[model samples]
Target: MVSQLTVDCNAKIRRATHCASGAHYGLIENVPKDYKSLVAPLNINVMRAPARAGNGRQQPIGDVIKVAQRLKESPGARVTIELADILPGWPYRWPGIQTWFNEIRSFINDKKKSGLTNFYGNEIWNEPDVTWKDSNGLSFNQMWKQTYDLLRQIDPNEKIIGPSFSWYEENKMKNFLQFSKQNNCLPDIIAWHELSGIDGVSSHFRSYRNLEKSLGISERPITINEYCDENHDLEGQPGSSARFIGRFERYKVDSGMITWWFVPHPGRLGSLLASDTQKGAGWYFYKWYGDMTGDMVSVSPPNENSKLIDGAASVDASAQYVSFIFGGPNDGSVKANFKNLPSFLGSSAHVKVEKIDWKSKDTPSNGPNTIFEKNYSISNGQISVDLSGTNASSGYRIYITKA
Candidate 1:
């Protein structure tokens, strides 16, 4: 339930209007009222809207506190708040920074009194390595230090996560951590944004491991606060939402995983349900990731085609089902090798196939084809899919269920 917040103040108002209208029009609405069910397991990251030079004049402290209050009223439901970047170029003067910190501290104090124990913190700038500059043209380290100190005084109990670097640069991470340590100020959680060519979640996890080892702070949490591959125009681009879900399934075993922006609006990075005009590589990633519920036990492609196309499978322990996805620009067939498949799957399994083209408006739907319907006996404790007839021009999905 990693949700996106409206970053534009006007967009937020539009969203509120749309939600109110949708309820009256019998259309699906995504308002705070639906947060309890729509965003159940994961928390939401509220971006600073209107992008003021300092903290936006629109204080979401009241809105956030109300949301927290709602969550408190709902038994067995949990919600958390993340203070997003306060907009670059905002002066770090005590007056500006204190105004922002007071709002945050008040929100946390109110939420605490409301019995909502889940609250998080973030700095006022994102990708400082790319957008920050100091007086006399100094590096972003000074600004980061000032922001960290301001938030620390407000509520040291909350986890402070930043500088939310856009890419994986060992040198940048090292410098940020080293500077923080020198100042006796350390982040509770190290956060960053990752795009494509980073090897998927497994590879990213390894990077986190190496970073923690180098920093000598293995206990601190690491979060990929913002990530996606929407800009990539390829056959099968692994966007941020899918990557986040993949990483969440893996890293949640050890750390926290927060996906970027949940709501769909104009000019944002990623959205779970975006419009056809706004549809990019990330739409599929968001849809599939949000729909999926389970752990990925194993994913082994049989041939070079599936391997190159990034097709893999996993089981949903709660649903007792197995799902698979394959993508490529060639029509050649490949085999999917599954290990430790549940016995309920038996020798034969029920499967559904779909082709998704991000460039088109057609939704992924059922087709009249049976890749495997018979009791294809498992040999050597594995099942294989002869995906030879798959269309190479478009991407496809393969879903399996125990019959």
Candidate 2:
């Protein structure tokens, strides 16, 4: 079956947030060697790191901040920090959690005093649904309220994100929200994880919206702090991330962090890097995604429910170009119907289509392979380009220049 993507080139939907460039433990080393060449190309907007671990060997707060600063050196690449990695063990008492919170506050205070900008929200706990336990009659919700209160007292301006579940469970979310509401310590940024696929994105978002409305609370910023899973050996695949980027942009998510499959490997940039400084197929796709500027345009996937072929598109009038990145779970043909040609692009359009080849996540890739390049005559402000030989593991990019 031929997948379809309908792009309204003239539509300036919204400013490109590049929210999908987030990664879990994407930065580890303090230096900027591989970061500039391998990770910075993706325009990583946000990264999650640990504040301070008891073991103290993992990625600490300072090292991660330095890497994020290096990322900010590149124009159009300003990465924010989300401290999701916290204490390693499950704490049963409030004092242990309070001590951890104090350490985090001191660290942040020092960083901010040293002129640190681009700092994002703080996730007090990571995956409270399972990691948390009811010890000595202490529930997770009570612990959350206490932690939220302490954090607010220490740093009033710092944003707090919560309910970072391993996965989305409606009942769990509802119960947590109720407890938070009753305690008057709701999270500043609502967050959860999507470890499976993109199919639950819209429905989950809509359901959360409904729940928020029903509870009579104003909506807060939402982030899928962790996404994608190591299923079907598809972790870090370009095609899978492309579908995620498409949905994340479509659903208007604040950010979506790619999950790290190997907890032991600290600094592979979410498997986008073959080594600390080499490019993988996923890196190229994200590079294409990061290169997109101006405004996001409207793009319709073949079928939202099918999950076959999906991607994101953007038009940059200033640059006189239109870009699209797309792929899916199966090998097949796909068509991109470009409509509403802007005035800058004349009757003829120079089109370049490239394929981001994929092997294993650790395999190095030279770069994207250009499938074809030519000037196509636009008929009635539309041009339908059929991209054949699509790969389930790879992704494709379309670049249209003014002709």
Candidate 3:
């Protein structure tokens, strides 16, 4: 259930982080043929199969590039591919290393040939517990050292994000980074998965950052290349996506959403679940996050619980607007108590509020409808926006601006 919320404008929660929209590999072969993308068109940084027959062989590098062009998004977002062998360790301990080198060389070279310059980065492997392989296989530090040197040998400039763990494992990450210092194989970006409901994505980030500090590993950018709530629940709900996105921005780490594309839940954008070519709630949710910029301000819930009601707020001083997206259960009444309403909204009381509520799944567009225009009046440094009639299963994105 979405929360009855409050926003304190006077409380700035540090500069805005980042909003990483879209699924892991959206550019693959099966994107819905005619659907328009993205409430927030996803970043082009996507993960792909590393290679076959070694040395970047068999990667669909050009295919994704063409598809991204069709999607009308940038190409250089960052490209990540795992090693060739899911398991290559019977005799040759580091068989995958040969695969990694050739595959990366080919992919980057292809990108250059295609007239594309931005290659986000590379991943040594995915779910080491699952796919990582080789004889004398790189375990813990050994793996880190070999992979690091290999990546540097390939491209001295591009960054390498590795040990794509299954989840946010503290000891694993710390130990890897700890040994990284000694081996000088420190990763340029930390990579992990949030397959379950990442309650406070920031918490994982917080602990991970602390671990980095303790281990004396270089502080680098972090990326969640695979993310989805437990059971892939956040796939198409604006309320859920809205809330999770808040923390995603709070940490401002580079991230990617997991795709359950085999099914067709057509209303959601970026979700492979969408049945047809229609933008679903995920599209709107990501667009809401994707479109905004500037510093992140504070948004508080009525209670300190998780997911009952979640809100994310940001302010664009230049545009002189404050926007917030809040989501959760809409079965009942929700009083959006927006506090410390920015003075830029004007004490004169003419403030504009634009909102899009969760709509029937059958609705053509999941984006909000403007239920109230220039109707909200801010007073006493707060704005009370009442949402009593909102549908039971809906989300509302509130944009408060100077009238």
Per-residue CA lDDT of model 1 for 184-295, tens digit only, reads: 6677766666543434445555666676677776456555544444343331233222333333433432233323332233122223223422343433443343344454
Give the TM-score of each candidate: 0.64, 0.91, 0.79
Q: Order candidates by TM-score, high to low.
A: 2, 3, 1
Q: List candidate 3 stretches off by more than 4 Å.
A: 13-18, 29-96, 133-141, 260-269, 302-305, 329-331, 348-366, 389-393
Superposition error at 104 for model 1 (Å): 4.7
Clash count (model 3, backbone only): 35
> Per-residue lDDT of 1-403 in model 2, one digit per residue for the tens?
7777899977666888898886777776542265656665677777666654334423333354565456566544434344444443343223456565666777677667756566576677777776776653467787778768877887688788877887776788888888788889899888888886667766788788788999877998788877874373565678888888888787778877878767655566677777666777888888899888988888898765545668899888899898999887754888899999766778999999999898888898998899999998988899999887787778899899976
Clash pairs (backbone) in predicted model 1: 3-262, 4-261, 4-262, 85-124, 86-124, 228-240, 330-392, 331-392, 333-387, 333-388
TM-score for model 2?
A: 0.91
lDDT (Cα) of model 3? 0.58
lDDT against the true structure, per candidate, is: 0.43, 0.74, 0.58
Model 3 lDDT tens row, 307-345: 456667887888888777777645466777777777777
Worst 10 residues of 1 by lDDT: 17-26
**The candidate that achieves the highest lDDT relative to the unseen native structure:** 2
What's the CA RMSD of model 1 in angstroms?
A: 10.5
Q: Cα deviation of 385 in candidate 1 (Å)?
A: 1.3
Candidate 1: stretches off by over 4 Å: 1-84, 88-120, 136-139, 196-205, 230-269, 276-294, 301-308, 311-313, 316-318, 326-332, 360-375, 388-396
